[PDB]
Amino acid sequence: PPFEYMILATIIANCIVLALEQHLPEDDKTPMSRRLEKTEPYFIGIFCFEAGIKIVALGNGWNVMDFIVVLSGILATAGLRTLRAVRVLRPLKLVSGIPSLQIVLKSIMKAMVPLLQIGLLLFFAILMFAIIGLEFYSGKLHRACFMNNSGILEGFDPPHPCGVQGCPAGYECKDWIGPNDGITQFDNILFAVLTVFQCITMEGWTTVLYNTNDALGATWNWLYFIPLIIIGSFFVLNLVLGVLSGEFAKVKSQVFYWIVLSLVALNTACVAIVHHNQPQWLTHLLYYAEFLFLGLFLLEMSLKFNCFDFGVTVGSIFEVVWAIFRPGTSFGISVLRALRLLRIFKITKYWASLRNLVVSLMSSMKSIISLLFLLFLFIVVFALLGMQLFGGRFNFNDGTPSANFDTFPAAIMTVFQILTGEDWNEVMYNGIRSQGGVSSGMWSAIYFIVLTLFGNYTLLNVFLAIAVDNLANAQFEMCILLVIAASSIALAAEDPVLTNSERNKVLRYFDYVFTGVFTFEMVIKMIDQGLILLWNILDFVVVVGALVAFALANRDIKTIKSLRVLRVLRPLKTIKRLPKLKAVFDCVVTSLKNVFNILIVYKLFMFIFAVIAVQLFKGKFFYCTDSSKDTEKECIGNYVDHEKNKMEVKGREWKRHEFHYDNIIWALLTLFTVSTGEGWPQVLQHSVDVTEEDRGPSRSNRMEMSIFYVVYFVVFPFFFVNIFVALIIITFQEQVVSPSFEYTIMAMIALNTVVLMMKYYSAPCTYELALKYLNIAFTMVFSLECVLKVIAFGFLNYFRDTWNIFDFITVIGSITEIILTDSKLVNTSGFNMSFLKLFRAARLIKLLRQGYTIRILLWTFVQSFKALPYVCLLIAMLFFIYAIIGMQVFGNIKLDEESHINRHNNFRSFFGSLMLLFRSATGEAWQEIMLSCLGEKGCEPDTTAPSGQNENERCGTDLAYVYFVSFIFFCSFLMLNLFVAVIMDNFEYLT
Amino acid sequence: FPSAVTIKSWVDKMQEDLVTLAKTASGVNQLVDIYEKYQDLYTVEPNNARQLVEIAARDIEKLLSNRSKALVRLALEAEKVQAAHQWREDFASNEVVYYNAKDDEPGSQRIKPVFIEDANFGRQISYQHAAVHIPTDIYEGSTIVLNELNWTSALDEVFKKNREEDPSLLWQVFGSATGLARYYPASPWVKIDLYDVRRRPWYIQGAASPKDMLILVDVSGSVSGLTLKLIRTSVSEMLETLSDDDFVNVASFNSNAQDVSCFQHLVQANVRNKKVLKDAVNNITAKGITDYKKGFSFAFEQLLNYNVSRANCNKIIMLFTDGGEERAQEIFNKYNKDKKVRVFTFSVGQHNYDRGPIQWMACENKGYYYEIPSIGAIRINTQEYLDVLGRPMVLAGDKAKQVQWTNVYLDALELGLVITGTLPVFNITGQFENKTNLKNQLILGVMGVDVSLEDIKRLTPRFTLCPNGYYFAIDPNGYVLLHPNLQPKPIGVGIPTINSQEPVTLDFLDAELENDIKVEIRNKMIDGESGEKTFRTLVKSQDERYIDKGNRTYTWTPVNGTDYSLALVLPTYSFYYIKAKLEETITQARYSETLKPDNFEESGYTFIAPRDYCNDLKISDNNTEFLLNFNEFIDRKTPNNPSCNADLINRVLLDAGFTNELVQNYWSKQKNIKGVKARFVVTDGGITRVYPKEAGENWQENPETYEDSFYKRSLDNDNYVFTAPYFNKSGPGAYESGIMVSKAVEIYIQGKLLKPAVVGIKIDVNSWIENFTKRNSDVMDCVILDDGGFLLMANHDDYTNQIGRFFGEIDPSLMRHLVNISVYAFNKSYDYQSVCEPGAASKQSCITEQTQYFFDNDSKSFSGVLDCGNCSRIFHGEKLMNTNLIFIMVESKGTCPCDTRLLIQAEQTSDGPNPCDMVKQPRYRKGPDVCFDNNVLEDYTDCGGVSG
Ligand SMILES: *[C@@H]1O[C@H](CO)[C@@H](O[C@@H]2O[C@H](CO)[C@@H](O[C@@H]3O[C@H](CO)[C@@H](O[C@@H]4O[C@H](CO)[C@@H](O)[C@H](O)[C@H]4NC(C)=O)[C@H](O)[C@H]3NC(C)=O)[C@H](O)[C@H]2NC(C)=O)[C@H](O)[C@H]1NC(C)=O
Ligand SMILES: *[C@@H]1O[C@H](CO)[C@@H](O[C@@H]2O[C@H](CO)[C@@H](O)[C@H](O)[C@H]2NC(C)=O)[C@H](O)[C@H]1NC(C)=O
Ligand SMILES: *[C@@H]1O[C@H](CO)[C@@H](O)[C@H](O)[C@H]1NC(C)=O
Ligand SMILES: [Ca+2]
Ligand SMILES: [Ca+2]
């Protein structure tokens, strides 16, 4: 019957109505929202009517949902927590309307059985670091130095905690609410779990590390935070993709063709030369050439990826005609004709390879059309829930944020941003603040935690669906080696600032003898091999560069420094010496060769998107320092600045946003930064506000520009990125004894863990006494159990098991901690013993695995570091090399606030450089760091080497672009290779 | 309890002793005898009040006429110069030469002036050119500012010509509508400089006619957050542009329209009402659903009241919203069918709501549309409606060119209290052929000229009349142009809690004690008419401690040039004054010889009055070097006095001769008296002589005779007057000075009463207390009080330590009972110009409640019993004859264990009077009779959004 289609149309109309209304703060309603409320009974009338029709003949979980919805609806109009089960959940009944989406939903929910079990480990690993950080960071983040002396407030825009460090410029610190308005701190177990979880997703973890860095000291906090990123997120992300694959496993002339192929190579060059402030004659030339190309393409269409070249060529005529009658914005569709660059492979061979690639691509793309729609329905439901929860509540005294839930497009944009996982902590802070603050609004973090968990469950199932389809489309050496290590070590112990200091004084001669040994190896190898009769050329160029640097060492301030960078290649020659590292390098190179074909089409699509974005935005990203001025002519002079409640006089400057689309190269860089995922909400905010070619931006001028970023995020990161890992995997298949005592000890340690997770700040004194007494009782019980085990099992044979040895180690450490905790005259405030708390916080390390949690894991249960974890040595070498290069190049930049090169993050020291590189690899503000490490920057003062010049030359180079881009590209590629190597490790187990 | 007759006899003995000692020591009778025995070195002349008031009014009118002539010349020349301009688009080849102030660039070249030091200005000035002030937000070098500088450079010639015509001319300034101000003479500008010439009160008063502004604030839910505080700041800044001739009210609406404050109708928009409205607006919350119809109907109803006093002029509605879809066309088609009310609308905050209906209703009712997206735009967008309001004024033509005078305000360039003339300047370009009429509906700017209050004070001499007499001029609003109680400080309002913009508007009824006769006189003066009234009133002394009753004669007349009204207050015994007639140099030399400081041991320490005797004599505020300068000048300058007025000199030398001969003939006979510590005489000439030269360093009195509180107190009273010393070690003299007494010298020349001087002594406290004993009696204490309830001494020798203290601050019960039985009367006032210590939540200025006590009845004996609870307090009270002292005896307070709240008569900070009910019965005032609105020729086809 057609009675079902009428219900479907009604559901569509109700979804459209729900997508129309907006929420205003403080019981305010727009006049349009009154009309929508008028048609509440009409929509629910037939939803209650359909229940009666289906109840007189039927007497599944979807009918339950519809009944719940209608029951909540009828009770909602009698008068409000009940107006959420009938509104935000109503679009979900579209799934029950049709059986296709019902079958699709059953395909993705049947793959979560191995995923829910392994996700329990992530919660249990989060519980570890929550307890560990609770005993070390509790209540130690409540002192930030303001000292206004006039308004007893202010200070630093990011508040700087004192702890035991002391604010350098002076000041003193009274009570402080907390780092992120008192939300991101380890006060109790619930706060610690949220802080650990929000930094296991690599969002704001650096801010958390730095907040505890200047409150306790920069010595041991890295030991807590680096493993939390490595063993917390790197392993879990690897584990979920590993276990998800576990279920997956088991005209006709050639001359005319050449002419038309070369002709389309000029259409792309004509749209790739468009740039801001181009000459007017260039504009006229391109205006003529566009019409000429369109006419020629239409003529050859009349004469004659045939379908792709059909709509694209025809679309240009419509685009030119439609825009002619409306002078203004020009979206651009002509560059879509560039897809014919794929049909050029037959000339350069590998044509069949591109055919297989493109066939797999279109086959995989479609295989997700139903899952993508099912994905979008959940996005709509979550956006509606956020509107019902945070709608009209983000109107703060400082202005409403760009990521709000006031209107349906805004809520959709915010939900999409949180799903991409970028800056979701900021939106969660805003929601917590809106719902009341830390005192009463912490219940709204559940919405963002649940939504974030679905963002990973989103890409996981989409990646799984790609791989399933992709199979269907498949048919004296030691001494010379040690002298390299000594030279590499000597490369790291330098001061980039103090060019003439004792360390450099004693290191120049060390470098001289290293070069002497290297040239001895040079000279001894020119007789055995007879020159020429490969990386030996690399060794030769390194040695000749060293010789040249020595030659013109004895002008010498900037020219000679570039030659000294060549010595950072000393760790590279270790690859040839080690056969075990040579194999890993060979595997990396062959993996790059195997996947290089997809990189070509990826680059082509990136070029197309950048060309589209150049015409879409171009010179619209300019702005003036004060919002009043809208053009460069008026943006001149001085203006009064009311920012941050402080009145000041500043000069007006016509500036440009850091990341823009003026050139093709600038657009490519911006798109790459967006693809990495960092800073893309800011780019979207800048792009939405564009007004005209040479005018200042106006907020939310055109919100339709977010469609570009939605399509870009659907295509490039969500689809092309996991095509690499999927196709690499495709080319991969072919290569004491009593029961009561045992029960009590297992149950007793459960109580100790519970006792462990109840310490909290500002607890009553009697609470602390009870906690201490419980700890003492548990320690005594453990000592009694250990002495019983020793008596009944023999002292020497007691340590015959690793678990028993570990348990005995903690018990002795527990006794030592208990005795020394109270102490008396041996307080020794200097000798503050704290590391023995690790045994108390690791008792659960043994309490775990009641069954087989490890076995539940795949990479952890099966041999992890069998042989493939040898690739980890290659990543360490890359980090070392880039840290050395950064120290040598950017190591002398002057540190300042209001920039991403400062005391917390800089290149001054080797370990600071490694921390910066790790932060960039995880990805926090690597684009901002690259911006800070640019040319004409301040220079750190050189007390040594006295001279009459102060400014001399400006430190900071313009090679930061290539440096950072290449670094993160190499890091991502090596991470992908590490993942496929772990797949190597567990190949036998999964079969 | 002693008998009444015995106490009366004891009091009679004490008062007889005190009076006899004062009479025989001060030597008043000798001074009277000598004054009546000479009668030849001076003549008595009348002080006819009517002629004096007429002369002063004519002088003030002439001064304001000079200022009006200068203003007219400047305005006409500016109009003519601007009519012939070319509007060059480039100034790189033809640089503009001008001096920019506040400097320590392409398109223009600076000027380096000499900056000589010149009198009548406290700063460095240059007469060679005119300075230019450009506000921070406005950039010099743009086309508008460069064209303005080029066409306004022609005003320097007129500035110089005006200066040469009247050398006693203060700042002349032309305030451009562009934003820059060009003033002459050139002088450097005074943290962040927020000055803007378009917000100054004189510019606001010259830009447009008075208005009837009514502010509508949308307080629906959608305005909560940043836009709410933006709206609050915008409303405060908009209120800051309103003067005392405008009437304003603030309303809010969210599905219901109501007033944000206690006013309920249009109010006078003075400082108090403006502060009340600001405090009410800063405490509103956003909640509900907008309803434009209700709010607009409420505003239109409040603009059509006419029950209360209004301006009967520009009626404007300020709508502060964010956006919406409702247009409320029916409301506008109902109330203002003929469009008699302009509607100005503002869109505040960053939002994306529909601005269509807002713009439509803005520029359909002859109004304008403005946008305030941030804090920076608040200051500029809240002053631009005066361009719209001024279109009928410019369209009127020559009729709308009248010099207007502002309220007394502190000068922006640190010159003191000044008033400013004002004349608008019209864009007349294209009027030769009468074809443009498109940008000629805006004023070019406003011309202004400053008049210092010292110039007006110079035209009303006060040294020919007694210190109790004075002049004062009044406003049509009732404020005082000049008055003895007007001070160069801002008037306070509210309480100064901490966690030069406003004028000094002091009403006549707040300058001195209010009365029904005072109100009638003020009303008769405001509307403008001659008159004269003599009556009996109570006047407050200079120190806020005493109130005295005296007969006054008020003579007033209007100044014909302007709307001011001038009155002269003149008591009895002051219609005739002493004028010295003498021209022989021998007498002048023999009178001036007794003034050198070295000749003080045999004549007594002599003070001088820092009066303006002539230009070459500088006032130093030292009185140790001023006297030396004065007598050196009189021994050096020729007696003919070519440039030194001889009336003051002759008076001071005659009075010096009289005082010296009195000291030599009488005081030198008795070198020391056991009961007298110092003997002083203060005269109308301006000299105070203290017989004991030593006593000199203890004389903490103003050298000027006309500023001595005891002098006026003794002038008013017939009998002797006792002055209570200060308290809490306000200086030396608690025990080393004594109790001051005084007595006015009455003189009869030909049966005509004259009071030229006062004499008195400083009675030693020890001798008087010893005579009082003839001590530490715990059964009873006997005290002596004066007019004001101030202690002189007691019998416990513990009240004696707290000398000169209010009797209620130590024994509140007896003081309260004395007030209750109507032996003392008290009146409270408000001091709107008083420095206040900041409170909780430098120093600020706030209202202060002042109280004074004085004798109520003429009865002499007051006896009764105080009932303080389960105890009896028997007492008696007797007032000493021929003085201002009262002797009361009470029993010890220790017997009756009771203690009430202490009664304090001091500078009590306060916040009243409450202005919610003040506006219900406002004081009478007269508004301007000239209005400019509703011209048919007005364009009003330009909204605020079509231009954008
Ligand atoms: C007193 O009134 C007179 C007129 O009654 C007035 O003189 C007029 O001044 C304006 C400039 O402010 C002249 O405008 C010319 O015409 C247009 C309009 O400004 C300008 O062309 C561009 O116009 C756009 C907007 O339409 C503007 O954004 C842009 O800046 C303008 N300039 C460009 C693009 O270069 C012309 O440039 C401008 N002429 C020149 C030489 O710049 C009127 O022509 C003047 N009218 C007359 C009759 O002379 C005068 O300013 C008023 N006095 C004061 C103090 O303002
Ligand atoms: C406006 O600027 C112009 C150009 O600077 C002035 O015109 C010049 O004035 C000088 C001085 O009298 C003459 O010598 C030139 O011949 C004028 N014309 C030029 C330079 O082209 C003009 O005087 C200025 N307006 C006013 C009111 O000063
Ligand atoms: C200015 O006013 C005075 C009186 O105050 C008058 O005598 C004089 O004529 C006026 N004009 C000039 C130029 O002084
Ligand atoms: Ca991030
Ligand atoms: Ca609203």
Numbering used by the authors:
A (entry chain A): 89 to 147, 158 to 177, 186 to 356, 473 to 526, 540 to 710, 1155 to 1212, 1221 to 1241, 1249 to 1429, ...
B (entry chain C): 27 to 130, 139 to 224, 232 to 540, 553 to 827, 843 to 909, 970 to 1076
Paper quotes:
The R-type voltage-gated Ca2+ (Cav) channels Cav2.3, widely expressed in neuronal and neuroendocrine cells, represent potential drug targets for pain, seizures, epilepsy, and Parkinson’s disease. Voltage-gated calcium (Cav) channels permeate Ca2+ influx in response to the membrane depolarization. Cav2.3 channels, a ternary complex comprising the extracellular α2δ and the cytosolic β subunits in addition to the α1 subunit, are strongly expressed in the cortex, hippocampus, striatum, amygdala, and interpeduncular nucleus. The transmembrane regions of the α1 subunits all share the canonical voltage-gated ion channel fold, wherein four homologous repeats (designated I-IV), each containing six transmembrane helices (S1-S6), are interwoven in a domain-swapped manner.
Supporting the structural analysis, deletion of the entire CH2II helix (residues 773-791, the resulting mutant named ΔCH2) had no impact on channel activation, but shifted the V1/2 for the steady-state inactivation from −70.9 ± 0.1 mV to −57.3 ± 0.1 mV. Following our standard protocol, the structure of ΔCH2 was determined at an overall resolution of 3.1 Å out of 68,109 particles. In the absence of CH2II, the segments on the intracellular border of the membrane and in the cytosol, including the α1-interacting domain (AID), which is the elongated helix succeeding S6I, the cytosolic fragment of S6II, the III-IV linker and the carboxy-terminal domain (CTD), are barely discernible in the final map. The entire β3 subunit is completely invisible. We had expected that VSDII would exhibit an “up” conformation; however, it is clear that VSDII in ΔCH2 remains down, identical to that in the WT channel. Accompanying the rotation of S6I and S6II, the previously sealed I-II and II-III side walls of the PD now both have fenestrations in ΔCH2. Consistent with previous structural observations in Cav and Nav channels, S6II has one π-helical turn in the tightly closed WT channel, which transforms to the α conformer in the ΔCH2 structure. In the structure of ΔCH2, the S4-5II segment and its hinge with S5II undergo the most pronounced structural shift; the hinge rises towards the membrane by approximately 6 Å. A lifted hinge between S4-5II and S5II together with an unchanged VSDII result in a sharpened angle between S4II and S4-5II, which is no longer compatible with PIP2 binding.
